[PDB]
Amino acid sequence: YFKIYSKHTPINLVRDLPQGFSALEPLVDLPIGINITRFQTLLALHRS
Amino acid sequence: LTGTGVLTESNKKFLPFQQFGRDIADTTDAVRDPQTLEILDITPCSFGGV
Numbered sequence A: 001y002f003k004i005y006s007k008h009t010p011i012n013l014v015r016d017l018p019q020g021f022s023a024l025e026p027l028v029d030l031p032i033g034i035n036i037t038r039f040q041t042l043l044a045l046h047r048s
Numbered sequence B: 001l002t003g004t005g006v007l008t009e010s011n012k013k014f015l016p017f018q019q020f021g022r023d024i025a026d027t028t029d030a031v032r033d034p035q036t037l038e039i040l041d042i043t044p045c046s047f048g049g050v
């Protein structure tokens, strides 16, 4: 069972993590049923 | 979810992933109606000593 908990927070700090409290609400409970041991996030390039 | 209690209109605002609410004794004291999405308090029926 793949649980997605999410929270969006308006911040204005430049570099590091903000110091504060914000609870993450559950968004999507996803029925995959597969083995996960390694992950990788996706970025986007800018071309000019 | 079965039970017996007085149903009143509730001021609690449930998050959309929430269906019911539990008290200290884990009895459902607030519930969302599954047809019209509104919250109801469930006060128990009166108990007395005769």
Ligand SMILES: *[C@@H]1O[C@H](CO)[C@@H](O)[C@H](O)[C@H]1NC(C)=O
Pocket (backbone or CB within 6 Å): B034, B035, B036
């Ligand atoms: C039917 O149930 C849905 C929730 O699943 C609700 O949004 C809708 O208003 C209901 N319609 C009627 C006619 O009760």
